[PDB]
Amino acid sequence: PLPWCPHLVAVCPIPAAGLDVTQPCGDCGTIQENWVCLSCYQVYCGRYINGHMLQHHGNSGHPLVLSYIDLSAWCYYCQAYVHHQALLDVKNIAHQNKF
Ligand SMILES: O=C(O)CCc1ccc2ccccc2n1
Ligand SMILES: [Zn+2]
Ligand SMILES: [Zn+2]
Ligand SMILES: [Zn+2]
């Protein structure tokens, strides 16, 4: 996984309500394999369910998303996982909610 990407600039502040790692997909309602968008904090399902986060990427252009299953961060432009100090706050808030 990459130690930086040129899309980390689009990672936005964490809502003061925090994150709910059990939040369902905003399109289909599935509780399985959701991701949270690190720009707008909408929650959509992964590619193996109904691909709604991929659809969100395409209709918004938002680059980076966080898995509620393992707290990895994927960039859809770089087609890679990324970790950087800029992702620790959001990973830590999700880790606290999850565990
Ligand atoms: O939309 C999702 O399923 C999330 C983005 C994601 C995460 C890991 C990937 C690995 C290989 C190919 C595509 C990936 N996409
Ligand atoms: Zn969905
Ligand atoms: Zn978004
Ligand atoms: Zn990137």
Side-chain angles (χ1 to χ4, degrees), residues 1-95 97-99:
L2 303 165
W4 184 86
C5 103
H7 309 93
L8 291 168
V9 292
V11 173
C12 294
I14 302 142
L19 298 171
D20 173 5
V21 304
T22 73
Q23 188 171 328
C25 177
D27 288 332
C28 68
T30 185
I31 67 179
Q32 303 190 53
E33 301 265 316
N34 293 307
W35 296 70
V36 59
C37 183
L38 295 183
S39 301
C40 72
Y41 294 83
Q42 295 164 30
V43 176
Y44 300 110
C45 68
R47 65 205 176 288
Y48 298 126
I49 312 301
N50 299 312
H52 290 127
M53 190 55 90
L54 183 63
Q55 175 182 304
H56 176 64
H57 167 70
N59 68 43
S60 65
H62 296 166
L64 279 148
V65 297
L66 180 73
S67 175
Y68 284 160
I69 296 332
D70 74 349
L71 307 185
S72 58
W74 177 262
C75 183
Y76 285 103
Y77 291 102
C78 296
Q79 297 182 262
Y81 291 103
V82 180
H83 180 73
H84 188 269
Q85 190 168 12
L87 301 178
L88 294 170
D89 282 343
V90 72
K91 288 181 181 191
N92 287 337
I93 283 173
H95 195 273
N97 182 251
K98 188 167 180 80
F99 299 110

